[PDB]
Structures are given as structure tokens and as C-alpha cells.
Amino acid sequence: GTTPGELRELTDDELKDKLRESKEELFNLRFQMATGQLSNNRRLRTVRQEIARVYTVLRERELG
RNA sequence: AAGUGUUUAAGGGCGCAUGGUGGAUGCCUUGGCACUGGGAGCCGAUGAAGGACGUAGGAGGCUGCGAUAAGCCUCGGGG
């Protein structure tokens, strides 16, 4: 539910809010992984690339 | 009565058999060498060449990539 089309539909403020949410989620995932209580360790990569997508869409909007 | 007389192997040699070590030989190849015909003949302050440190769920090397970190977006090809 984080496809580039959806991200581009979202607004700049909404994109930054989803950006911060994904950063909080990545922080939580890192902490669970370090404590040994993250079953789906691919969540880290999924959230990292979701952050990458949010940056990419924001920078695309900044450029034009 | 005198004389004659094979008979041992601590070890060694030679040879044969049978092994070990070693990595020659033969047959190869993932790699090189010399060229041929084309492309491009420059990259860099829009920060180059080259790197240090990082980066995957897990340690390191090589590879890729830079805190968007074996990756992000768009457009194509393929299934």
C-alpha cells in the first residue's frame, strides 16, 4: 500500500507525514530486530525502500 | 687316526612385488598474449580519476550502491 502512484497522489505535507511515519516504523523495526523480536526481517527493507520512494517523489516534485 | 664339509645376517646390496610422499606427464580450462574490424576518443568546481567509511536479517572479502546506501523513480524489453 505504498506504491509510487499512491505516493504521487499524496500531497507534499502528506508525503512528509508518511515520511516521518515510515522513519518511526523503521526505528521500531531496528529496535525489534536488535532485541531479536522481529519475525519478518524483510520489513526493514520494505520500509527503507518506502522511505526512498517518498524522498524520490518529493524530489521529483521539487524538480518538476 | 688327519682331512673334507653345507649350515647364521646385527646390518647392507641387487632385483621383483606392493605401498606412501610428491606433483611431473597426458588431456583440459575460469585466465592470458598478439592482432583484425568497428564505436568512442576525453572526464572534472553540476566536484573528476581514484579512494576512506558505510550499506543486506545475520561475520568478512569481492561486486553493487551511498544515510533514498546489493538500492529509489520514469520509460522500454522479457515472461
Curated annotation (Swiss-Prot):
Tell whether Ribonucleoprotein is among the UniProt keywords: yes
A Gene Ontology annotation in the biological process aspect, one of them, is: translation
Superkingdom of the source species: Bacteria
Signal peptide, first to last residue: none
The regions listed as transmembrane in this protein's record are none
Protein's organism: Mycolicibacterium smegmatis (strain ATCC 700084 / mc(2)155) (Mycobacterium smegmatis)
| Span covered, complete protein | 4 to 67 of 77
Quote one Gene Ontology molecular function term.
Answer: structural constituent of ribosome
What are the UniProt keywords, alphabetically?
Ribonucleoprotein, Ribosomal protein
UniProt protein name:
Large ribosomal subunit protein uL29
Presence of keyword Ribonucleoprotein: yes
**This protein's GO CC annotations:** cytosolic large ribosomal subunit
Q: Which family does it belong to?
A: Belongs to the universal ribosomal protein uL29 family.
